[PDB]
Paper text:
Immunoglobulin G (IgG) is a crucial mediator of the defensive mechanisms for eliminating infectious microorganisms. To gain mechanistic insights into the molecular process behind these interactions, we attempted to observe the dynamic interactions of an anti-GM1 monoclonal autoantibody, GB2. This autoantibody was generated by immunization of mice with GM1-like lipo-oligosaccharide purified from a C. jejuni strain isolated from a patient with Guillain–Barré syndrome. Our study visualized antigen-dependent assembly of the GB2 antibodies on model membranes, giving rise to hexameric ring structures, which particularly interacted with C1q.
The bacterial IgG-binding proteins, protein A and protein G, have been reported to inhibit C1q binding to IgG antibodies. Our HS-AFM data showed that GB2 scarcely formed the hexameric ring structure in the presence of the B domain of protein A, which is known to bind the Fc region of IgG antibodies. We solved the crystal structures of the Fc fragment of GB2 and that of the same IgG isotype in the absence or presence of the B domain of protein A, respectively. Our crystallographic data also confirmed that, as in the case of previously reported crystal structures, the Fc interacts with the B domain of protein A at the cleft between the CH2 and CH3 domains, which is also involved in protein G binding. These data indicate that the antigen-dependent hexameric ring formation of IgG is mediated by Fc–Fc interactions, which is disrupted by competitive binding with protein A. Intriguingly, the mouse anti-GM1 IgG2b(κ) antibody GB2, in which positions 345, 430, and 440 are occupied by alanine, glutamic acid, and threonine, respectively, were highly preorganized into the hexameric ring on the antigenic membrane formation without artificial mutations. These amino acid residues are not directly involved in the binding to the B domain of protein A, which, however, sterically inhibits Fc–Fc interaction. Therefore, the inhibition of C1q binding by protein A and protein G is, at least, partially attributed to the prevention of Fc-mediated ring formation.
Author numbering:
A (entry chain D): 6 to 57
B (entry chain B): 242 to 262, 279 to 288, 307 to 319, 335 to 444
C (entry chain A): 237 to 443
The structure:
């Protein structure tokens, strides 16, 4: 419930992710919210990677 | 043609649906949409119209003093200064959901924002027996899209 | 083709005797080329002729809007007489009738409470005074604000919302400077309703 929400809220505002990455991060998040913790970190670091 | 319910969009654990009664690419699953396709403004015709997007203040008002001599009282949740008008207020006592509430329409305030009032009726026995009442707001302006301000009797 | 809309009197005009209720008929999309429109009025199918009808140019879509206001007596509105407006034009084969009438039925006085600003809001530049009016039938009500005898005009209020018991509740929010909430000695919420003694009840608060 609560963890997988802050997940969704941050993933949606990560500014260097592209459409498809964000799209698949959510999908791969509402399908087994267990790894909500790890899926943030994953998207988090893939953002910094793709900064200009 | 209608938008989806705003609580359905601002929480990933629910499903927003566009009702006839996607950017010119056919989809064959009607009877439901991705939360992100609506927020970034795709055309379904209808879209999520953005404008100024201000975040609400959320205060709980207790029963007015004059009403506490009665057999029923009224909790008030005033939510102020938000945009767009679309918002979702709902009530809990600790963790169990209270649903004898009614709420007004979003009203345009003087600064072009919106306020909304929500009113939980309960027996006066319930107001002094139950330890917490929490009012639960879901606007896009809020962090995590969620906000929970709580009042207790004293 | 043109269309007619009918509109019931101002709840403030009804709940004060010195003032004068009016029923109104508005005609929209009257062609600029035939702005002549005939309007007859029928308080209980009795034709009446006191209707004041004006013809207006709607500069937005280049059409004519006709407005006929028939002033009425309190007792005929309050009793539930059925006011009717017939409207005939060239662009109307056979005319168009609108009818309106008060909803005689259940009536309940409101309770009226002033809610002080929430505790968390005392610290900004502006506060919010709440007037909670609950339990009234029918849904037509009037809430205004005063601080002593000086009328306050920065109020906004909600639609009467139907509560659970079949009553209407309503909220009126007076925003003000936080200096005003602490400077001024008394703020009054003032409700008019057809269920109150003298159609009026005043509730007043201090800091
Ligand atoms: C050409 O342009 C004009 C003007 O354009 C308008 O104004 C410009 C400036 C632009 O802003 C533009 O976008 C606007 O469109 C168009 O004129 C409009 O035409 C509409 C119909 O096509 C007509 O429809 C609604 O009328 C009622 C609302 O009107 C009141 O509120 C308006 C909002 O502020 C205001 O403009 C009006 O003046 C009017 O105000 C009130 O007037 C009283 C009399 O003077 C006064 O006492 C009162 O104080 C005052 N208050 C306020 C706050 O203004 C609606 O109620 C009405 O609803 C009915 O019809 C629709 C569909 O038919 C339903 O969805 C409704 O539910 C309702 O049906 C009734 O339902 C009830 C139950 O719900 C039943 O019991 C009844 O039997 C039903 N029928 C009746 C007759 O009651 C309309 O939705 C606009 O009012 C009208 N405005 C004006 C100013 O003329 C015009 O159409 C254009 N032509 C085109 C596009 O071809």
């Amino acid at each position: 419930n609560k963890e997988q929400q802050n997940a969704f809220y941050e993933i949606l505002h990560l500014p260097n992710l592209n459409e498809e990455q964000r799209n698949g991060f959510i999908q791969s998040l509402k399908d087994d919210p267990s790894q909500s913790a790890n899926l943030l970190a994953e998207a988090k670091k893939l953002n910094d990677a793709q900064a200009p | 043609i209608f938008p989806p319910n705003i609580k359905d969009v601002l929480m990933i654990s629910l499903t927003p649906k566009v009702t006839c009664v996607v950017n010119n690419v056919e989809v064959h699953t009607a009877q439901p949409i991705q939360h992100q396709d609506w927020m970034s403004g795709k055309e379904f015709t209808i879209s999520k119209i953005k404008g100024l997007v201000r975040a609400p203040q959320v205060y709980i008002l207790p029963p007015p003093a004059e009403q506490l001599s009665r057999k029923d009282v009224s909790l008030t949740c005033l939510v102020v200064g938000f945009n767009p008008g679309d918002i979702s207020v709902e009530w809990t006592s600790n963790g169990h959901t209270e649903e004898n509430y009614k709420d007004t329409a979003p009203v345009l305030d003087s600064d072009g924002s919106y306020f909304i009032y929500s009113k939980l009726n309960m027996k006066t026995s319930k107001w002094e027996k139950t330890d917490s009442f929490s009012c639960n707001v879901r606007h896009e302006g809020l962090k995590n899209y969620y906000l929970k301000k709580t009042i207790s009797r004293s």
